[PDB]
Amino acid sequence: EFHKQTLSSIMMPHPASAPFGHKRMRLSGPQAFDKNEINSLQSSEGLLEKIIKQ
């Protein structure tokens, strides 16, 4: 699944005016997300912390 964000199609959206990105950050432009919603969607977690949590 760490290969999937290098392989999936989430970062190829449909419109010609939207070349790449996420749908939530595209929503955040016109429909500004709350401060919780800005930092909830982003996630940069190392593998070893998940491993030791499991």
Binding site: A16, S17, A18, P19
Partner: protein, 191 residues
């Protein structure tokens, strides 16, 4: 800063297209055809500018969450920075359904239309799209349309920021893989 574009034009009949898409899945990553369909609407502002503030607004009825997107493109450029692609001035903002009623205030009106429906593929910065253009009769409705052409009008677009030149090498080298199939050109919007 203000961004700019790179446009390559052409027209390819649909019967010979089936081999071309075989190359599109043979060099790029694992993407599938999309067949997106948009509604297009031409508007213009009759301001004190000599050239009217003419722009084209798109809206995808098939996909929810994509709002009305206005595209205001500039005059053709004869610069020596890029001799093989269109250099344009563009500002691209997406706003909700409060666009169309707001555009009635400054007299944005009925110029023309063309309905776009087709495939789009990408590889890094190049975006090659192959789409059908549809013309309307009795432009009040959207169902009384027809094919504006039989040959598919194929386009290739590369977006760049202000500056960031020396790009004609990579596009030409990547097009050399497809030169016996397609002959891209930098045609003027006029004549």
């Amino acid at each position: 800063i203000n961004m700019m574009e790179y446009l390559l034009q052409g027209s390819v009949l649909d019967h010979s297209l089936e081999s071309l898409i075989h190359r599109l899945r043979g060099l790029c990553d694992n993407m599938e055809p999309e067949t997106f369909l948009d509604h297009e609407m031409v508007f213009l502002l009759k301001g004190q500018q000599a050239s009217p503030f003419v722009l084209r607004a798109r809206r995808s009825m098939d996909r929810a969450g994509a709002p009305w997107h206005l595209r205001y493109l500039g005059q053709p450029e004869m610069g020596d920075k890029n001799r093989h692609a269109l250099v344009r001035n563009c500002v691209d903002i997406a706003t909700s359904e409060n666009l169309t009623d707001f555009l009635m205030e400054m007299g944005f009106r009925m110029d023309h239309e063309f309905v776009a429906k087709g495939h789009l593929f990408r590889k890094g910065i190049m975006k090659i799209m192959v789409y059908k253009i549809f013309r309307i009769l009795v432009p009040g409705n959207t169902d009384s349309t027809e094919a504006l052409s039989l040959s598919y009008l194929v386009e290739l677009s590369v977006v760049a920021p202000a500056g960031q030149d020396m790009v004609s090498d990579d596009m030409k080298n990547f097009a050399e893989q497809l030169k016996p199939l397609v002959h891209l050109e930098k045609i003027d919007p006029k004549r």
